[PDB]
Amino acid sequence: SDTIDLADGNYVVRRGDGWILSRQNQILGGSVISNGSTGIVGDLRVNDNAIPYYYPTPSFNEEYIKNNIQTVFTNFTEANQIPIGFEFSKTAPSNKNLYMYLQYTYIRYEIIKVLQHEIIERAVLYVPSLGYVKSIEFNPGEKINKDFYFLTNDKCILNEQFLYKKILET
Amino acid sequence: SDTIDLADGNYVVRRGDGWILSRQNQILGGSVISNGSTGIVGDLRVNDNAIPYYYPTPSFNEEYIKNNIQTVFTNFTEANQIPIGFEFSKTAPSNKNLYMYLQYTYIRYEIIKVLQHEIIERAVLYVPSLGYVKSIEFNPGEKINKDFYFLTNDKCILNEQFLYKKILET
Amino acid sequence: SDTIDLADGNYVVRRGDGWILSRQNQILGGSVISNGSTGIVGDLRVNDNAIPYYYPTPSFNEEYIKNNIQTVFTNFTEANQIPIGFEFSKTAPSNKNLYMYLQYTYIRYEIIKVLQHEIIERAVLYVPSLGYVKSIEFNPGEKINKDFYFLTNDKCILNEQFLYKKILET
Amino acid sequence: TQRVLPYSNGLYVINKGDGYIRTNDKDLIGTLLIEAGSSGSIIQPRLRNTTRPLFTTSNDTKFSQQYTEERLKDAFNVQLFNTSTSLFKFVEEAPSDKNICIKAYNTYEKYELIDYQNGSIVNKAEYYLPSLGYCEVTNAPSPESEVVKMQVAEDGFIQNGPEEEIVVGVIDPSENIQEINTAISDNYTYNIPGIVNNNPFYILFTVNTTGIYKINAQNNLPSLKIYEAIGSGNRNFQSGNLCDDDIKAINYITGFDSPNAKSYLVVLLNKDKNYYIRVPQTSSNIENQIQFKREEGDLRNLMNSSVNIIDNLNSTGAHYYTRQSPDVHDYISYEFTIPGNFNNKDTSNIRLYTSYNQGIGTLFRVTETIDGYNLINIQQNLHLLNNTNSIRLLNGAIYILKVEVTELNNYNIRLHIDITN
Amino acid sequence: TQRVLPYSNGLYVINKGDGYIRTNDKDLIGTLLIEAGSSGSIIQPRLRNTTRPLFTTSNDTKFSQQYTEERLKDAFNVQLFNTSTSLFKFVEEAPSDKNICIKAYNTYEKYELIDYQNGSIVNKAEYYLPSLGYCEVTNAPSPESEVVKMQVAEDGFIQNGPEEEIVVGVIDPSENIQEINTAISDNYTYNIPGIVNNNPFYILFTVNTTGIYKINAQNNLPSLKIYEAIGSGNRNFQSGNLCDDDIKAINYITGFDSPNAKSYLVVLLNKDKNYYIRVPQTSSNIENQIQFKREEGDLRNLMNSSVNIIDNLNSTGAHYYTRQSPDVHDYISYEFTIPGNFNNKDTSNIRLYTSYNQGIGTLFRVTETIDGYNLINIQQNLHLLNNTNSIRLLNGAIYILKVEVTELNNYNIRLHIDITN
Amino acid sequence: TQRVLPYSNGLYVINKGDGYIRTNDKDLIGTLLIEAGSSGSIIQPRLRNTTRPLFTTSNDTKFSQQYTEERLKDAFNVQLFNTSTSLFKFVEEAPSDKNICIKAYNTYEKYELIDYQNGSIVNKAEYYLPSLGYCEVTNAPSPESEVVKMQVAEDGFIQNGPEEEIVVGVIDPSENIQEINTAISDNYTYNIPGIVNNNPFYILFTVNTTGIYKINAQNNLPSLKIYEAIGSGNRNFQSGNLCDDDIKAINYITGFDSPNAKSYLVVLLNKDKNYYIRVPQTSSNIENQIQFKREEGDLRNLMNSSVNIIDNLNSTGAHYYTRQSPDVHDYISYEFTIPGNFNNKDTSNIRLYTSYNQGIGTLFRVTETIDGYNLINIQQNLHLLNNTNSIRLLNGAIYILKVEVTELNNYNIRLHIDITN
Ligand SMILES: [Cl-]
Ligand SMILES: [Cl-]
Ligand SMILES: [Cl-]
Known part of the structure; x- marks a missing residue:
């Protein structure tokens, strides 16, 4: 369930890179390439696409989350001011059409409260990382799985992680 | 001749992409690459190399041309404010020299007046599109055809087109 | 020794491109690439990394050096205002690690005073040119030669040159 | 031969696919003629971030461009409409034999915003969000065939991307969202507050334990509807409490629109999800309550549906x-x-x-x-x-x-x- | 052993080829030493648009740099002299066996501007327009041979591009251009206007129907010259009218420079082209007319030439x-x-x-x-x-x-x- | 089991290698999941030039960050600490069979600054200069193994670059540098000036002819040390004169730190090199001279060492x-x-x-x-x-x-x- 072999108290948790968010999949748009050509989509992580997503709880407000995350793990406020680019390249096979679309990935951080081997409270922070492309080869009028276009719940495209540190009192 | 199976009146005509202009061929310069190396020339279509070329007539002044062209076909004034780049890559064969030179291409638009299956008046607009490179392998002192360097009359490097719409009166 | 088959007087000397300077080798940093990936390091020669290195003598002060060099050979003050980039690409072999590091190269100019077939005075100017990468494949804990990391005396990675012109009196 | 749209009343945003271009080359970036052996690139480097979305509507006064954008943000979380930092680039190497042409077009992702009411669309907007291009490659044209004159096509679009229809319901913004801050266990009675009299409204609630629930108003009047908030409960969590993530993207589960229809709801609710209840416009000044009850018995056989009481x-x-x-x-x-x-x-x-x-x-x-x-x-x-x-x-x-x-x-x-x- | 230049009097712009570099490495961008397997690039990204054209002249007061640029614009339509948005980039992958060097140089396209008069050049300018580079690759230098001292070469240029000589006549800007706004049919008589007395001038005209024309002044005095405007009639068109495209690039067809020589012209004119007639400096205050006549008869045998009347x-x-x-x-x-x-x-x-x-x-x-x-x-x-x-x-x-x-x-x-x- | 550091007293800067990253992913730029056949790039384009060096010290008041940077400039000639124009970029093409991940980290080159005195380090600073990245590629993770919880590592670094230890002595900046502007031939006597009384100082000198030299103070008191300036004499040159290139990077040749120890130096000096002599703190107000003498005889057998006079x-x-x-x-x-x-x-x-x-x-x-x-x-x-x-x-x-x-x-x-x- 939400059971965890840890002592009572608060924790910062790095849950890994490679998280993609629900519903948000196609909002950057995509390319259609054809017949031997190569498509290359990319982005640049600066300023107003590097603004993170906070999800606080009664115990853990935003400031608390930011401060603990940046103390233990990476300081995203300093890092995300310096532009970093990324790109993906796909090649269309002869006499076929390829569609490729781009979405941001995030590092998922958590603040958890544990009481009697149980997580009774959890705050979440998504910090923009890089990106991820999905591609499909298609025919005119071919029906495509909804799952290719639309993500219902947040998932991690890599292996999830659980890197914790206990938070001590002021 | 200038005979056309259309009714009497005025027309906007998109004559296609891929037009190159007379005399203008080498004015951007060119590269000399040698012995296995790769040359890559390119440009960036913004502002003052995207300014179009007008050729009006007594009936069809510049404003008329611009307005009708932008109503029916692409609005070049809005488009040519947003930078678009293009590149070409050539590779020199071992122990030989290659020369490559760049020139702009244009979409050719026309305003025609037709009277009794005959074009009696024609205004022309060239809107900057992308570019085109010509290359040749050469020896020291080898005579090269003038035709490689110098275009005497405007031509289309692609198949010409004739996409028309009749213009109705104010 | 410092013997030269020239007449008495002063000379400007272009000693070639491809000079690297002592101690300075690793100050731009380097990349570690692994397992099939490709690393690409590069730079951009403008403004404050294109500022040249002067080494004047009692006869030949800086202004003298600059003026004679720029009169006879390339005018570096005008040239080094216009950005020029360069890049190097290395590929790591499967299941091995590669380290690549970057350093600037320079054109070496000299002002020499010759008296009785002997160079009795020499001023030196290093003008920033492009760059140069050294790479090595390594194992964890493998000892690497100091010579790979650290240059004790200025050398030329190409063939040295001696392109001279006699300087005539004001 | 029209499809029956069995949608519930309210607002839907529909992703109708990517790679839309306009007719008559209005979105042609241009053509490269690449000689054999060589390569050619067309690049959108985003030196300027400006983009040009296309918008049409049936009703400027409700579905304005602003409103429509807000709806797209509610549904799919789009937030850059005028701008883009996303690069695209097309590269083509021509084979050794023949020359090659590449045509590059700008594209749009087509969104449709509908107000669906009692069996037909009563308000409709189309928002074309600027996308990441279309690249067709062709063989080099031969001299000269002959140029055949053609009239311009009607104004409109052509889809070059793959078939797509993604339908997402959205919370009507003109209606209030009340909250039940405590997670529901076995029973709960929500008194209907005077702050939201007469007008329809939503109630956002969650459940303590995954199970089947009977939900209804007093005397089963009026009829209620129930939605699931899409992708809720994936993030922040407080035991026995509601965590509101401001999700306005909703999946209709069940419920009637006719408010004079006696009914109750029997639905399978997850503890790791939030749900909205919509209570409709009631033409009475009498107090009313929404009753929630966890069903442990045979009523579990009726999930998920509404039950009409026939009198x-x-x-x-x-x-x-x-x-x-x-x-x-x-x-x-x-x-x-x-x-x-x-x-x-x-x-x-x-x-x-x-x-x-x-x-x-x-x-x-x-x-x-x-x-x-x-x-x-x-x-x-x-x-x-x-x-x-x-x-x-x-x-x-x-x-x-x-x-x-x-x-x-x-x-x-x-x-x-x-x-x- | 000099070539005879049978050019007509006037101004010519000559494209003398691309890939010109200066002596003594004055235009060396630099050298990359690429180890085997690796690759190296030298890039001109145009982060600054500034370029540095080279100019020399024999006569600062007529052929100034401004004038010369205007002439290059007349001939080849060059318009950016100080700037460039055109990128160039050289890439080299060294073979698996040996190391490789690449030297990159900036280059120029060499233009020569001449004033050619009665059999020799009387004014001369050279304009070196900044171009798109030269890239020589060589094998890695071996240690150490031995460095052999060498004196610097004389100042000058070296062409690394292919052989090129493109000669284009240009309209002398100090002379007026009058126009015949009506297309010429079978006959036409142009009265010589007082607005252009004594000084030489041009007459821009076109023809209704492709055919051979006899053109002359009264009593075949003075001698006229005729030019074709290069690339004219490809664009705008009004039936039976002249469309002036402001083309100053001219091909000499025929005509004598000696103005006291009795002569007439017999030339094949196209309806889809414009032509300039140059009438020279006349030392008389008497009125004169230019006669145009379409030849349907045996005189068609004399195209294209001038005919001297021998008295x-x-x-x-x-x-x-x-x-x-x-x-x-x-x-x-x-x-x-x-x-x-x-x-x-x-x-x-x-x-x-x-x-x-x-x-x-x-x-x-x-x-x-x-x-x-x-x-x-x-x-x-x-x-x-x-x-x-x-x-x-x-x-x-x-x-x-x-x-x-x-x-x-x-x-x-x-x-x-x-x-x- | 500690190594004996037989270093002479004074300051050393040590390049301890490249490719250092911090623990707990503090320097992770990020991960790309590349599907098979495709490629992925991570790019540092330097659109902003800012970098973030890391610094720690044992003594804020001597080895401040400023001082430490000045020392790194003395040793290795580093001059950009906050900035960088150097691009790095990682590119990966996944093989046809399986998917591929690439993780990119920012890296540092680690420099250590020590003050080494009588057999131990008495002052220590670590300066981490921003470098050009680390790129590890791995196979695609499989669903799902299972996520195993792990505590965070202690704060610190991990080296991913190759082993490196480059030790470079540097001139102590608190001590004066006097110069002998004339090249030394067979004999020379340097009187010790009052401008540098009591405090230790350096004497920068060069030699006319490569040879072995005996160097000492009056009555062999106090003991002197001798350094070679690294990379000197490669550049500017005036016959029979010292050319000071302001090189503060020094290799210890020989000499004792105990100033009350009677001694003299016998060293092989090159004419194409500069050398520093360090004379220590002398507790006497008596005049003193440094004697240089070229040795042509048997004393050449003692190079390079100090000779203790045992009394x-x-x-x-x-x-x-x-x-x-x-x-x-x-x-x-x-x-x-x-x-x-x-x-x-x-x-x-x-x-x-x-x-x-x-x-x-x-x-x-x-x-x-x-x-x-x-x-x-x-x-x-x-x-x-x-x-x-x-x-x-x-x-x-x-x-x-x-x-x-x-x-x-x-x-x-x-x-x-x-x-x-
Ligand atoms: Cl029915
Ligand atoms: Cl003869
Ligand atoms: Cl011992």
Whole structure:
């Protein structure tokens, strides 16, 4: 369930890179390439696409989350001011059409409260990382799985992680 | 001749992409690459190399041309404010020299007046599109055809087109 | 020794491109690439990394050096205002690690005073040119030669040159 | 030959696909003629971030461009409409044999915003969000064929991307969202507050333990609807409490739009999800409450559907009841009482059938004990569409017909309960 | 051993090729030493648009840099001299075996601007327009050979691009351009306006129907020249009207520079082209007109050339006439009258020959009817150079010798008409 | 089990390698999941030039960040600490079979700044200069294994680059640098100026002709040290003159730190190099001079070492002398006089040995002629470490023991001269 072999108290948790968010999949748009050509989509992580997503709880407000995350793990406020680019390249096979679309990935951080081997409270922070492309080869009028276009719940495209540190009192 | 199976009146005509202009061929310069190396020339279509070329007539002044062209076909004034780049890559064969030179291409638009299956008046607009490179392998002192360097009359490097719409009166 | 088959007087000397300077080798940093990936390091020669290195003598002060060099050979003050980039690409072999590091190269100019077939005075100017990468494949804990990391005396990675012109009196 | 849209009343945003271009080359970036052996690139480097979205609407005053953008943000979380930092680039190497052409077009992702009401679209907007291009490669044109004149096409679009229809319901912004800050356990009674009188509104709630719940208003009036907030409960979490993530993207689960229809809801709720209840415009000044009850018994057999309470069944003959038809594989249920005195002997002949939609039905006898409601399955696999089969039931007894729609031929479902004797 | 330049008087711009670099590494961008397997790039990304053109002139006061640039714009339509948005980039992958060096140089396209007058260049400018680079790759230098000292080369250039000589005449800007706004049909008479008195000027005109035209001034004085505007008539078009595209790039067709030389022009004109006529400095205050006439008859045999009217042939003996020689394969014609009374019997021995240039000649007898001029071909394939062959012609009769230059040994052509009896 | 650091007193900057990253993903740029066939790039385009160096110190007041940066500039000529124009980019093409992940990290080059004094580090700073990245590629993760919880590592670094230890001595900036502007020939006497009284200082000098030089203060007090400036004499040059290139990067050649130790230096100097002499803090107000003398004779056998003058050898028995041990393969020499009257017959038994360090020794008899000093080699290949072999030498005679350290077990070398009879 939400059971965890840890002592009572608060924790910062790095849950890994490679998280993609629900519903948000196609909002950057995509390319259609054809017949031997190569498509290359990319982005640049600066300023107003590097603004993170906070999800606080009664115990853990935003400031608390930011401060603990940046103390233990990476300081995203300093890092995300310096532009970093990324790109993906796909090649269309002869006499076929390829569609490729781009979405941001995030590092998922958590603040958890544990009481009697149980997580009774959890705050979440998504910090923009890089990106991820999905591609499909298609025919005119071919029906495509909804799952290719639309993500219902947040998932991690890599292996999830659980890197914790206990938070001590002021 | 200038005979056309259309009714009497005025027309906007998109004559296609891929037009190159007379005399203008080498004015951007060119590269000399040698012995296995790769040359890559390119440009960036913004502002003052995207300014179009007008050729009006007594009936069809510049404003008329611009307005009708932008109503029916692409609005070049809005488009040519947003930078678009293009590149070409050539590779020199071992122990030989290659020369490559760049020139702009244009979409050719026309305003025609037709009277009794005959074009009696024609205004022309060239809107900057992308570019085109010509290359040749050469020896020291080898005579090269003038035709490689110098275009005497405007031509289309692609198949010409004739996409028309009749213009109705104010 | 410092013997030269020239007449008495002063000379400007272009000693070639491809000079690297002592101690300075690793100050731009380097990349570690692994397992099939490709690393690409590069730079951009403008403004404050294109500022040249002067080494004047009692006869030949800086202004003298600059003026004679720029009169006879390339005018570096005008040239080094216009950005020029360069890049190097290395590929790591499967299941091995590669380290690549970057350093600037320079054109070496000299002002020499010759008296009785002997160079009795020499001023030196290093003008920033492009760059140069050294790479090595390594194992964890493998000892690497100091010579790979650290240059004790200025050398030329190409063939040295001696392109001279006699300087005539004001 | 129009498809029946069995959507519930309200707002939907529909992703209709990527790679849309306009007619008559209005979105042509241009063409490169690449000689054999060589390569060519067309690049969008985003040196300027400006983009040019296209928008049309049927109603400037409700579905303005602003409103429509807000709806796209609610549905898919789009937030850059005028701008883009996303690069795209097309590269082509021509084969050794022949020359090659590449045409590059700008593209759009097409979104449609509808207001769907009682079986038709009453408001419609199309928003074309700037996308990441279309690149067709062709063989080099040959000299010269001959140029054949052609008239311009009508204004419109052409899709070059793959087929796509993604439908996402959105919370109507003109209606209030009240919250039940405590997670619901076995029972809960929500008093309807005066801050939201008369106007329809939503109630955002969550559940403590995954299970089937009966939800209704006092005397089963008015009829309620229930939605699931899409992708909720994936993030922040407080035990036994609601965590509102401001998610306005909603999946319709069940419920009628006709507010004068007596009904109750029976739905499977997850503890790791949030749900919205929509209570409609009520034309009465009387106080009302929303009752939530966890079902541990036979009522669990009715998930997920609304149950119509049929009251007017007090004579013999023909009785018919029209509701919005559920979609294929979805459910609708009717609770009725066979007319007459219950004396455990007197019986009537009952014929249940539909008029246009095909549905599989299962019939339950309902008796209430001191342990709750009991449901005895007395008839299975009833094929309702123009059914001629009849069954004898007890006068004065109470039955529930559960109907699964299998063939959706009509926007409405018409149930007939014909009684003879 | 100098080439004869049979150019007409006036201004020429000459593209002398691309890939020019200066001596002593003045344009070296630099060298990359690429280890085997690896790759190296040198890039001109145009982060700054500034470029540095090189200019030299013989006459700062006429051919200034401004003037020269304007001339390059007239000839080839160059318009960015100080700037460039054009990227270039050199990439090299070293083979698996050995290391590789690449040297990158900036380059120039060399333009020469000449004022050519009566057989020599009287004003000269060289404009080096910044180009798109030169990339030589070489094998890695070996340790150490030995460094051999070398003196610097003289200042100058080296061409690394392919051989090129493109010669383009340009309209002299100090001279007015008058226009004939109506397309010429069969006949036209242009009165010479007082707005352009004494000074030389151009007349821009077009033709309604492709055909051969005789053009001349009153009494064939002064001599005119005719140019075609390069690439004209490809664009805007109004039936029966001149459309001026402001094209200053001109191809010389025919005409003499000596203004005291009686002559007329016979030229093939296209309806889809514009033409300039240059009328020279006239030292007279008398009115004059330019006559245009469409030729449907035998005069069509004289295209394209100027015809010298020879007047002073009124005695027996040696007569000689010097003109600017046409280029190889171009024409020049002479109309003369055999001295004596025309009585249809009296005859003279005529010897026609050239002194240095070899030319093939055809002889015509000219009679004028009420239907126009008639040309009877009486002699073909005359090899003029030091010709000793003679022919007997009728006293008082009129002949035209058409001469095609086949070997250009002299800037001038010297025709001799020796008459005996 | 600590290594003995046989460094001379003073400041050192040590390049400890490239590719350092912090623990707990603090420097992760991010991960790309590349599907098979495709490629992925991570790019540092330097659109902003800002970088973020990391610095720690043991002493904020001497080794501040400013000071430490100045030291790095002295040692390796680093000059951009906050900024960088250097691009790096990682590219990966996934093989046709399987998917691929690439993780990109920012990296640092680690520099250590030490103040080393009498056998231990007394001040220490670590400066992490921003570098050009680390790129690890891995196979695609499989669903799902299972996520195993792990505590965070301690704060610190991990080196991903190759092993590196580059040690570079630097001029102490708190001490003056005097100059001898004339190149030294055979002899030179430098008077010690009052501008630098009491405090230690450096003397920068060069030599006219490559050769071995004896350098010392008056009466061999105080002891001097000598350094070579790294990479000097490669550039500007004036015959017979010093050219100061402001090089503060120094290699220790030889010399003692104990200033009360009588000694002189014998060193091989190059004409194409500059050298620094360090003269220590002298507790006397008496004038002093540094004597330079070119050695053409047998003293050339003592290069490169310091020679201790041993004075207190005037009784029989046990005598011992402690100095800083040279590194392996480096030299130290002792000049002593066998106690007693020199009458060319009386003799004593001498035992020379070390206590912990192993050294190969060669013994010289020293006689001074009118031609200079003469060195007769009377004993070779002496293994000093706990040597039991003894040799009979002449009372009143003068000897020099030259010692090459071969096994460095102790920071100090302890020489014993045991005398019996
Ligand atoms: Cl029905
Ligand atoms: Cl001749
Ligand atoms: Cl010892």
